[PDB]
């Protein structure tokens, strides 16, 4: 019932040229950008991935980004969001995804990344995000996705990691941050991605979880991240990707969702916003474009629902977890 109402002159066509132009000049306009330096590495990942999905990766600065990444790896092996910031699993994953996109993994010390990830696993199988010990299933996903891309999943205690994630499964079939936490689309994505990577999707109740996920779709066509919230274009990723992983993508109304996603584009500046007529950003641009790819848009490369990277990239490194269907 909390929902948006899409306006009749909302964009109803895909504006790929405008989106590629927007991403290509992002962070050059210079600007209060600035502000978000604490997530720069992930920001770089969002921009590069969306450009690669659109066939425009070449318009970004490969050599510049490789030097940036190398300078963000700390002595411990972990990667920070930006120079001078502290290492964290979130930015270690983003860095490794970028290097995978660029087939440049040995730009960083891979052995030390593996040792950093290994070091953050706790006795109950969970992962802290960094040395300060915040525990979240997001970090379980970051750890196994990073390791899978490096060919090193065997470096962690996988059965204990699985046990922890399964302890986060809820009455409604979903997953939250930590044991006891309420179900949230974001955490469901992390956990179903984790279970895909570790070959445990048989432990998910796909019919129950799938229902919870498809009930995220509001009359507007957009998806929310949990009951009674407003829809947001990045749930087009979190919810759809989860549904794809568990074989239930056809349980949402694809045409209505596609219309919602297209309505979130800015026809003048390019990019996507969280909701129609809000301000655009690279995060929502990636997730809008990636959502459209999952829905089968022909102008966009197929996207991995687990890694949010072009499938052709994952095929190259031979890391393509089996999904339910």
């Amino acid at each position: 019932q909390k929902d948006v109402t899409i306006k009749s002159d909302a964009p109803d066509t895909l504006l790929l040229e405008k989106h590629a132009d927007y991403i290509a000049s992002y962070g050059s306009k210079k600007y209060e950008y600035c502000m978000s330096e604490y997530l720069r590495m992930s920001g770089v990942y969002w921009g590069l991935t969306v450009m690669d999905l659109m066939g425009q990766l070449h318009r970004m600065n490969k050599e510049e980004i490789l030097v940036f990444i190398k300078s963000c790896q700390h002595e411990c092996g972990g990667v920070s969001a930006s120079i001078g910031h502290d290492p964290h699993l979130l930015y270690t994953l983003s860095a490794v995804q970028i290097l995978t996109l660029y087939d440049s993994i040995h730009v960083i010390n891979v052995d030390k990344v593996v040792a950093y990830v290994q070091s953050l696993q706790k006795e109950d199988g969970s992962f802290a995000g960094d040395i300060w010990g915040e525990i979240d299933t997001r970090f379980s996903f970051c750890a196994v996705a990073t390791l899978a891309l490096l060919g090193k999943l065997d470096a962690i205690n996988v059965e204990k990691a699985i046990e922890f994630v399964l302890s986060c499964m809820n009455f409604d079939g979903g997953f939250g941050c930590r044991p006891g936490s309420e179900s949230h689309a974001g955490q469901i994505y992390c956990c179903t991605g984790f279970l895909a990577i570790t070959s445990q999707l048989h432990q998910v109740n796909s019919d129950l979880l799938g229902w919870w996920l498809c009930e995220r779709q509001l009359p507007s066509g957009g998806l929310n991240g949990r009951p009674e919230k407003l829809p947001d274009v990045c749930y087009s990723w979190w919810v759809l990707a989860s549904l794809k992983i568990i074989g239930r993508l056809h349980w949402i109304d694809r045409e209505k969702l596609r219309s919602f996603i297209l309505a979130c584009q800015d026809e003048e500046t390019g990019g996507f916003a969280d909701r129609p007529g809000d301000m655009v950003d690279p995060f929502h641009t990636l997730f809008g474009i990636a959502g459209l790819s999952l829905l089968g848009e022909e102008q966009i490369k197929p996207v991995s629902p687990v890694f949010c990277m072009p499938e052709e990239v994952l095929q190259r490194v031979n890391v393509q977890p089996e999904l339910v269907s």
């Binding site: 502290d86 300060w132 009455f171 409604d172 309420e182 009930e215 056809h250």
Partner: protein
């Protein structure tokens, strides 16, 4: 607008600059607490600055008197609470509070539970706060029964109940410690009040579907449970009349018939799937798959006829 934020930007930029200089110099002092307080208020997701605050507090704890140390932690608690008032949904702020409390000799957990009750009366769906409440409850060894009493008052005083029903789903098995039937019947009564009080309110319907699966077989249906479920069925049919566009009550009618006797209600189940698909067309594919599953279940039941 555009001018004043060119000023703010250059303030945050030079304070950020200043913090990183001090850090590289190993100056772990109240300087740096002053500088980061000015940045973290508006930008609590700047994780590295929470790390800097922790490094300073750790350092000072070794070089200050216990009373000076105690004063710094109380100042930190006030800082944290002021940050949460402006941005109550920042992961970093809530984690810093947890890091700080976990360190203390010392901690006043009943006060922290009150902080939680206060933030939850402002936003009953703030998952960070519910997660913090579970943290505090485990530290203070608060028993599941007390937390159960907290959830009841929350569900009845107003809606926005998904977070509180979810918490009950976790508590009920602990106090148990697959629910016993007496408990299940009382829960069914509580949830059925809720969704008849506000039939819109998706959270009670989600929790009810769980309850319908959380019992013994059926048909090892007791006469009391059989009768309660039949009563629910008729009450949902009444609600269907009052609220003809309500999809939740239609789905629940189907699920109740399944719980009661799949084969005896086959005809009605099929009729209800048609009505429901017309009322909730966005879920047509889900509903067709559910119907297909139920029909296969029915074929197995019929083939069990020797």
């Amino acid at each position: 607008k555009r001018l004043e934020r060119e000023q703010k930007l250059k303030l945050y930029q030079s304070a950020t600059q200043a913090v990183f200089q001090k850090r590289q110099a190993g100056e772990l002092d109240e300087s740096v607490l002053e500088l980061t307080s000015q940045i973290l208020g508006a930008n609590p997701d700047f994780a590295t600055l929470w790390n800097c605050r922790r490094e300073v507090l750790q350092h000072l704890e070794t070089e200050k008197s216990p009373e000076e140390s105690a004063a710094l932690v109380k100042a930190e608690l006030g800082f944290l609470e002021s940050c949460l008032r402006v941005n109550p949904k920042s992961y970093g702020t809530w984690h810093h509070r947890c890091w700080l409390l976990s360190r203390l000799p010392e901690p006043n957990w009943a006060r922290e539970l009150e902080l939680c009750a206060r933030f939850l009366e402002a936003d009953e769906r703030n998952f960070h706060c519910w997660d913090y409440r579970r943290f505090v409850a485990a530290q203070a060894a608060v028993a599941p029964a007390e937390e159960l009493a907290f959830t009841d008052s929350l569900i009845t005083r107003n809606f926005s109940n998904y977070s509180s029903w979810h918490y009950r789903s976790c508590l009920l098995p602990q106090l148990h410690p697959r629910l016993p039937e007496n408990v299940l019947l009382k829960e069914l009564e509580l949830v059925q009040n809720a969704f008849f009080t506000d039939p819109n309110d998706q959270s009670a319907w989600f929790y009810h579907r769980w309850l319908l699966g959380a019992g013994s077989g059926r048909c090892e249906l007791s006469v009391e449970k059989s009768t309660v479920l039949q009563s629910e069925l008729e009450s949902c049919k009444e609600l269907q009349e009052l609220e003809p566009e309500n999809k939740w009550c239609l789905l629940t009618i189907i699920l109740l018939m399944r719980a009661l006797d799949p084969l005896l209600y086959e005809k009605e189940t099929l009729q209800y799937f048609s009505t429901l698909k017309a009322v909730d067309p966005m879920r047509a594919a889900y509903l067709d798959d559910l119907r297909s599953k139920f029909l296969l279940e029915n074929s197995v039941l019929k083939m069990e006829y020797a």
